[PDB]
Protein backbone atom coordinates (compact mmCIF):
# COMPACT_ATOMS: atom_id res chain seq x y z
CA UNK A 1 0.00 0.00 0.00
CA UNK A 2 2.46 2.63 -1.19
CA UNK A 3 0.71 5.99 -1.79
CA UNK A 4 -2.28 5.62 -4.08
CA UNK A 5 -2.82 1.93 -3.26
CA UNK A 6 -5.16 0.68 -0.54
CA UNK A 7 -6.57 -2.66 0.50
CA UNK A 8 -10.33 -3.11 0.89
CA UNK A 9 -11.42 -1.76 4.25
CA UNK A 10 -11.27 -4.23 7.11
CA UNK A 11 -14.58 -5.06 8.82
CA UNK A 12 -15.22 -2.88 11.84
CA UNK A 13 -13.17 -3.74 14.91
CA UNK A 14 -14.65 -3.46 18.40
CA UNK A 15 -13.94 0.02 19.76
CA UNK A 16 -15.06 2.52 22.39
CA UNK A 17 -17.43 4.54 20.19
CA UNK A 18 -20.32 4.61 22.68
CA UNK A 19 -18.01 5.81 25.44
CA UNK A 20 -17.32 8.96 23.39
CA UNK A 21 -20.92 10.11 22.96
CA UNK A 22 -20.88 11.98 26.29
CA UNK A 23 -17.08 12.43 26.56
CA UNK A 24 -14.54 13.81 24.12
CA UNK A 25 -11.04 12.89 25.33
CA UNK A 26 -9.72 9.36 25.70
CA UNK A 27 -8.67 6.15 23.99
CA UNK A 28 -10.86 5.06 21.07
CA UNK A 29 -9.04 1.83 20.19
CA UNK A 30 -6.04 -0.14 21.40
CA UNK A 31 -4.52 -3.49 20.47
CA UNK A 32 -1.04 -4.93 20.97
CA UNK A 33 0.47 -2.68 18.28
CA UNK A 34 -1.43 0.60 18.15
CA UNK A 35 -3.25 3.05 20.39
CA UNK A 36 -5.72 5.50 18.85
CA UNK A 37 -6.45 8.44 21.14
CA UNK A 38 -8.90 11.28 20.62
CA UNK A 39 -9.25 14.85 21.87
CA UNK A 40 -11.96 17.13 20.57
CA UNK A 41 -13.81 20.38 21.15
CA UNK A 42 -17.01 21.66 19.55
CA UNK A 43 -18.78 25.01 19.43
CA UNK A 44 -22.18 25.48 17.72
CA UNK A 45 -21.90 23.68 14.33
CA UNK A 46 -18.09 23.42 14.27
CA UNK A 47 -15.56 21.10 15.86
CA UNK A 48 -11.91 20.19 15.88
CA UNK A 49 -10.76 16.65 16.65
CA UNK A 50 -7.18 15.49 17.18
CA UNK A 51 -6.40 11.82 16.53
CA UNK A 52 -3.27 10.41 18.16
CA UNK A 53 -1.64 7.27 16.71
CA UNK A 54 0.71 5.57 19.14
CA UNK A 55 3.14 2.83 18.14
CA UNK A 56 3.42 0.51 21.15
CA UNK A 57 6.21 -1.57 19.56
CA UNK A 58 9.92 -1.16 18.88
CA UNK A 59 9.37 -1.58 15.12
CA UNK A 60 8.43 1.16 12.68
CA UNK A 61 5.02 1.30 11.05
CA UNK A 62 5.49 1.83 7.32
CA UNK A 63 3.08 3.15 4.70
CA UNK A 64 0.94 4.37 7.60
CA UNK A 65 -2.25 5.59 5.92
CA UNK A 66 -5.32 6.82 7.85
CA UNK A 67 -8.45 7.40 5.75
CA UNK A 68 -11.77 8.86 6.89
CA UNK A 69 -14.63 6.96 5.24
CA UNK A 70 -17.91 8.82 4.75
CA UNK A 71 -20.71 7.91 2.34
CA UNK A 72 -22.00 10.61 0.01
CA UNK A 73 -25.11 11.28 2.10
CA UNK A 74 -22.99 11.76 5.23
CA UNK A 75 -20.58 13.99 3.30
CA UNK A 76 -23.56 16.18 2.34
CA UNK A 77 -24.44 16.67 6.00
CA UNK A 78 -21.01 16.56 7.70
CA UNK A 79 -17.95 18.26 6.23
CA UNK A 80 -14.58 16.89 7.33
CA UNK A 81 -11.22 18.41 6.41
CA UNK A 82 -7.84 16.96 7.35
CA UNK A 83 -4.14 17.14 6.51
CA UNK A 84 -1.60 14.50 5.47
CA UNK A 85 0.02 12.19 8.01
CA UNK A 86 3.64 11.06 7.64
CA UNK A 87 3.57 7.37 6.58
CA UNK A 88 6.41 6.36 8.94
CA UNK A 89 5.63 5.98 12.65
CA UNK A 90 8.71 5.15 14.69
CA UNK A 91 8.58 2.51 17.38
CA UNK A 92 7.35 4.08 20.61
CA UNK A 93 6.41 7.29 18.79
CA UNK A 94 3.07 9.09 18.60
CA UNK A 95 1.78 11.00 15.57
CA UNK A 96 -1.10 13.47 15.38
CA UNK A 97 -3.87 14.08 12.85
CA UNK A 98 -6.24 17.06 12.95
CA UNK A 99 -9.81 16.85 11.64
CA UNK A 100 -11.78 20.07 11.22
CA UNK A 101 -15.51 19.45 11.36
CA UNK A 102 -18.59 21.34 10.18
CA UNK A 103 -22.14 20.10 10.70
CA UNK A 104 -24.05 21.11 7.55
CA UNK A 105 -27.28 19.39 8.58
CA UNK A 106 -28.33 16.67 11.01
CA UNK A 107 -26.98 13.18 10.34
CA UNK A 108 -27.09 9.63 11.71
CA UNK A 109 -24.16 7.76 10.23
CA UNK A 110 -20.73 7.93 11.81
CA UNK A 111 -17.45 8.35 9.91
CA UNK A 112 -15.23 5.28 9.83
CA UNK A 113 -11.51 5.68 10.49
CA UNK A 114 -9.54 3.09 8.52
CA UNK A 115 -5.84 2.63 9.25
CA UNK A 116 -3.54 0.57 7.00
CA UNK A 117 0.17 0.05 7.61
CA UNK A 118 3.03 -2.43 7.43
CA UNK A 119 4.49 -3.90 10.63
CA UNK A 120 7.57 -5.98 9.85
CA UNK A 121 6.08 -7.14 6.57
CA UNK A 122 2.68 -7.98 8.02
CA UNK A 123 -0.33 -6.10 6.65
CA UNK A 124 -2.35 -4.24 9.29
CA UNK A 125 -5.84 -2.96 8.45
CA UNK A 126 -8.09 -1.60 11.21
CA UNK A 127 -11.51 0.05 10.87
CA UNK A 128 -13.05 1.86 13.85
CA UNK A 129 -16.14 4.06 14.18
CA UNK A 130 -15.24 7.70 14.82
CA UNK A 131 -17.42 9.36 17.51
CA UNK A 132 -18.60 12.39 15.58
CA UNK A 133 -22.29 12.30 16.55
CA UNK A 134 -25.15 14.74 16.21
CA UNK A 135 -25.07 15.72 19.89
CA UNK A 136 -21.55 17.12 19.46
CA UNK A 137 -23.35 20.16 17.95
CA UNK A 138 -25.66 20.46 20.99
CA UNK A 139 -25.43 23.72 22.96
CA UNK A 140 -26.91 23.58 26.49
CA UNK A 141 -29.71 26.05 27.21
CA UNK A 142 -30.67 26.89 30.78
CA UNK A 143 -34.29 27.96 31.08
CA UNK A 144 -37.08 28.43 33.62
CA UNK A 145 -39.75 25.81 34.24
CA UNK A 146 -42.38 28.06 32.66
CA UNK A 147 -40.32 28.48 29.48
CA UNK A 148 -39.76 24.73 29.25
CA UNK A 149 -43.45 23.81 29.50
CA UNK A 150 -44.42 26.35 26.84
CA UNK A 151 -41.92 24.78 24.43
CA UNK A 152 -42.83 21.21 25.43
CA UNK A 153 -46.50 21.88 24.67
CA UNK A 154 -45.73 23.32 21.23
CA UNK A 155 -43.83 20.15 20.30
CA UNK A 156 -46.90 18.04 21.06
CA UNK A 157 -47.30 16.96 17.43
CA UNK A 158 -46.37 13.25 17.43
CA UNK A 159 -43.79 13.76 14.66
CA UNK A 160 -41.74 15.90 17.05
CA UNK A 161 -41.66 13.33 19.88
CA UNK A 162 -39.63 10.13 20.04
CA UNK A 163 -39.87 7.94 23.14
CA UNK A 164 -38.01 4.79 24.12
CA UNK A 165 -38.20 2.41 27.09
CA UNK A 166 -35.06 0.41 27.76
CA UNK A 167 -33.28 -1.66 30.38
CA UNK A 168 -30.55 0.09 32.33
CA UNK A 169 -27.06 -0.93 31.28
CA UNK A 170 -25.37 0.75 34.25
CA UNK A 171 -26.05 1.37 37.95
CA UNK A 172 -28.94 3.80 38.38
CA UNK A 173 -26.78 6.48 40.01
CA UNK A 174 -28.28 9.97 40.08
CA UNK A 175 -24.91 11.73 40.05
CA UNK A 176 -23.50 9.68 37.15
CA UNK A 177 -26.73 10.21 35.18
CA UNK A 178 -26.62 13.99 35.62
CA UNK A 179 -23.00 14.01 34.44
CA UNK A 180 -23.93 11.96 31.35
CA UNK A 181 -26.66 14.45 30.42
CA UNK A 182 -24.24 17.36 30.77
CA UNK A 183 -21.58 15.48 28.81
CA UNK A 184 -24.14 14.87 26.04
CA UNK A 185 -24.43 18.64 25.52
CA UNK A 186 -27.73 19.30 27.31
CA UNK A 187 -28.44 21.64 30.16
CA UNK A 188 -29.72 19.86 33.26
CA UNK A 189 -32.89 21.60 34.43
CA UNK A 190 -33.73 21.19 38.12
CA UNK A 191 -37.28 21.35 39.48
CA UNK A 192 -39.06 21.32 36.11
CA UNK A 193 -40.56 17.84 36.28
CA UNK A 194 -42.48 17.79 39.60
CA UNK A 195 -41.09 14.28 40.17
CA UNK A 196 -37.70 14.87 41.84
CA UNK A 197 -36.47 11.47 40.61
CA UNK A 198 -36.77 12.44 36.93
CA UNK A 199 -34.24 14.34 34.81
CA UNK A 200 -35.02 17.15 32.35
CA UNK A 201 -32.70 18.67 29.78
CA UNK A 202 -32.74 21.27 27.05
CA UNK A 203 -30.38 22.45 24.34
CA UNK A 204 -30.07 23.62 20.75
CA UNK A 205 -28.56 21.61 17.91
CA UNK A 206 -26.59 23.90 15.59
CA UNK A 207 -26.32 23.19 11.87
CA UNK A 208 -24.92 25.46 9.18
CA UNK A 209 -28.39 26.95 8.58
CA UNK A 210 -30.66 26.01 11.46
CA UNK A 211 -30.96 26.02 15.23
CA UNK A 212 -33.07 23.05 16.34
CA UNK A 213 -34.47 23.35 19.85
CA UNK A 214 -34.44 20.13 21.83
CA UNK A 215 -36.07 19.05 25.10
CA UNK A 216 -35.60 15.76 26.92
CA UNK A 217 -37.12 13.86 29.82
CA UNK A 218 -35.48 10.81 31.40
CA UNK A 219 -37.56 8.79 33.86
CA UNK A 220 -35.90 6.05 35.92
CA UNK A 221 -37.78 3.17 37.47
CA UNK A 222 -35.26 2.12 40.12
CA UNK A 223 -37.10 -1.07 41.13
CA UNK A 224 -37.60 -2.44 37.60
CA UNK A 225 -34.15 -1.15 36.52
CA UNK A 226 -35.71 0.52 33.48
CA UNK A 227 -35.75 3.97 31.93
CA UNK A 228 -38.13 5.92 29.73
CA UNK A 229 -36.53 8.59 27.53
CA UNK A 230 -38.62 11.22 25.71
CA UNK A 231 -37.20 13.64 23.14
CA UNK A 232 -39.24 16.56 21.82
CA UNK A 233 -37.43 18.71 19.28
CA UNK A 234 -38.28 20.98 16.39
CA UNK A 235 -37.10 18.41 13.81
CA UNK A 236 -38.34 14.83 13.52
CA UNK A 237 -35.00 13.31 12.47
CA UNK A 238 -33.20 15.11 15.32
CA UNK A 239 -35.65 13.70 17.86
CA UNK A 240 -34.99 10.26 16.41
CA UNK A 241 -31.19 10.41 16.36
CA UNK A 242 -30.83 12.03 19.78
CA UNK A 243 -33.16 9.46 21.34
CA UNK A 244 -31.17 6.68 19.67
CA UNK A 245 -27.88 8.04 21.00
CA UNK A 246 -29.01 8.88 24.55
CA UNK A 247 -30.85 5.57 24.98
CA UNK A 248 -27.49 3.77 24.92
CA UNK A 249 -25.93 5.79 27.75
CA UNK A 250 -27.71 4.56 30.88
CA UNK B 1 -45.19 -1.84 26.25
CA UNK B 2 -47.99 0.69 26.59
CA UNK B 3 -48.98 -1.03 29.83
CA UNK B 4 -45.38 -1.34 31.00
CA UNK B 5 -45.13 2.39 30.40
CA UNK B 6 -48.41 2.67 32.25
CA UNK B 7 -47.07 0.75 35.25
CA UNK B 8 -43.46 2.01 35.45
CA UNK B 9 -43.54 5.68 34.36
CA UNK B 10 -45.75 8.72 33.88
CA UNK B 11 -47.72 10.82 34.25
CA UNK B 12 -47.34 13.16 31.25
CA UNK B 13 -45.05 16.13 31.88
CA UNK B 14 -47.62 18.52 33.38
Residue numbers in the entry:
A (entry chain A): 689 to 938
B (entry chain B): 307 to 320
Question: Please, what does the article write about this entry?
Answer:
Since FCHO1 and FCHO2 have been suggested to bind the AP2 appendages, we investigated this possibility. No binding was observed between the different C blocks and the AP2 β2-appendage. Crystals of the α-appendage were grown in space group C2221 in the presence of a 10-fold molar excess of FCHO1 C peptide (residues 426 to 448, SEEQVSKNLFGPPLESAFDHEH), which diffracted to 1.4-Å resolution. Although the peptide bound to the top platform site of α-appendage in the same position as FXDXF and DP[FW] motifs, the orientation is opposite to that in these previously determined structures. The conserved hydrophobic interactions by the FCHO1 LFGPXL Phe436 and Leu440 (equivalent to FCHO2 residues 431 and 435) anchored the peptide to the α-appendage in the same positions as the phenylalanines of the FXDXF motif, facilitated, in part, by FCHO1 Pro438 being in a cis conformation: Mutations in FCHO1 FG to AA, LES to AAA, and PP to GG reduce binding to α-appendage to below detectable levels. H bonds between the LFGPXL motif’s main chain and α-appendage side chains further stabilize the interaction. (D) ITC showing ~50 μM KD binding of LFGPPL to α-appendage. Mutation of FG to SS, LES to AAA, and PP to SS all reduces binding to weaker than 500 μM KD. Thus, C blocks of all muniscin family members can bind to the α-appendage platform in a manner that is competitive with the binding of FxDxF and DP[FW] motifs of accessory CME proteins, and in addition, the partially overlapping WxxL sequence found only in FCHO2 can bind to the Cμ2 YxxΦ cargo–binding site and therefore potentially stabilize the unclosed but not-yet-open form of AP2.
Proper operation of the pivotal CME cargo adaptor AP2 requires membrane-localized Fer/Cip4 homology domain-only proteins (FCHO). The AP2 complex, composed of α, β2, μ2, and σ2 subunits, is pivotal to mammalian CCV formation, and its deletion is embryonically lethal in mice. FCHO1 and FCHO2 are similar in overall domain arrangement —folded N-terminal acidic phospholipid-binding homodimerization F-BAR domains and C-terminal folded μ-homology domains (μHD) separated by a ~300-residue, low-complexity intrinsically disordered protein linker, which has been suggested to participate in AP2 activation, although how it does so is undetermined. We dissect the network of interactions between the FCHO interdomain linker and AP2, which concentrates, orients, tethers, and partially destabilizes closed AP2 at the plasma membrane.
